[PDB]
Amino acid sequence: GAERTIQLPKPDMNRAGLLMKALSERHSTREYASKALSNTDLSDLLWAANGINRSSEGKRTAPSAMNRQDIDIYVVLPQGTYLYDAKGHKLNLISEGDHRSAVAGGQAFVNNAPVSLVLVSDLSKLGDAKSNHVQLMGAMDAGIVSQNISLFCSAARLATVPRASMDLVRLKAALKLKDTQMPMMNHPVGYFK
C-alpha cells in the first residue's frame, strides 16, 4: 500500500525563474498533462507554498497572522492523501486511496490533475474557530499561500488554478479533519498538456 512517509528531496531554493516573468505569466489553467509531477517539482512547489525559509526562527515563505502558521497543506495524490511537514521536507500519510474527487466537488476537470494541494486553516491556532473575525484571518492566510503556489507554478511552467469549491463532507472525511480545521482553497497542479 501507500508509503507512510514520502521523503522529498531538499528544495532547490535557487531554481531558475524570474519573479516578474512569473507575474506576467500567472494565470488559471483547468487542463493538465496526465504524468505525475517529479519529486523535485513537488518538493520545490511545497517549499514555495509554505516552507521554512529561516531555519533558526522556524519562519516561513508565507506570512501568517501573529506568526501562528495556521495553514496546513494536504497533498492529494492518486495513491493517498498526505500532510506536508515543512520541518522535514516530507509528506506523512493521512488516508490511503485516491481522494481527488473530494477536492473536485462539482468540477470534474480537477480529477485530471495528478496532484491537488488543499489549504486548510487550523482555526484554533488563531483563536475561536467559530469567530467570523478568526475565519477572515485564516482566509487571508490561505490566499497568501495560494499565491505562492500560483507564482511558483508560473515560474516552473506548471498548470494550476486557485479554487474555493470542493465537496466538504467527503473532504473532511478523506483528510480526517477536526471540526476546528477549515478547508479554504485548493490547487490542482500538473504539467501543461
Q: Residue numbers of the site for ligand FMN (CB under 6 A)?
A: 27-28, 30, 59-60, 63-67, 107, 137, 140-141, 144, 161-165
28 is in an annotated binding site: yes
CA atoms of 21 and 150, how far apart (whole Å):
13
165 is in an annotated binding site: yes
- CB nearer a copy of itself, residue 9 or residue 63: 63
CA atoms of 135 and 44, how far apart (whole Å):
28
* Residue 19 interacts with a copy of itself (CB under 8 A): yes or no: yes
- Given a contact cutoff of 8 angstroms between Cβ atoms, the answer to whether 143 and 68 are in contact is no
- CB nearer a copy of itself, residue 115 or residue 155: 155
CA atoms of 50 and 73, how far apart (whole Å):
8
CA proximity to 43, closest of 2, 94, 90: 90
155 is in an annotated binding site: no
20 binds, among ligand FMN, a copy of itself, none (CB under 5 to 8 A by kind): a copy of itself
Type of residue found at 86: A
CA proximity to 5, closest of 83, 99, 77, 72: 83
The grid cell for 85 is 511537514
64 is in an annotated binding site: yes
* Residue 34 interacts with a copy of itself (CB under 8 A): yes or no: no
187 binds, among ligand FMN, a copy of itself, none (CB under 5 to 8 A by kind): none
- Given a contact cutoff of 8 angstroms between Cβ atoms, the answer to whether 193 and 32 are in contact is yes
107 is in an annotated binding site: yes
Minimum separation from the CB atom of position 145 to ligand FMN (A):
10
Look-up of cell digits 508560473: 154
CA atoms of 109 and 44, how far apart (whole Å):
24
* Residue 22 interacts with a copy of itself (CB under 8 A): yes or no: yes
Annotated binding-site members: 26, 28, 30, 54, 64, 107, 164-165
Instruction: List residues near a copy of itself by CB under 8 A.
Output: 12-28, 44, 47-48, 51, 53-54, 59, 61-63, 65, 132, 135-137, 139-148, 150-152, 155, 162, 164, 184-185
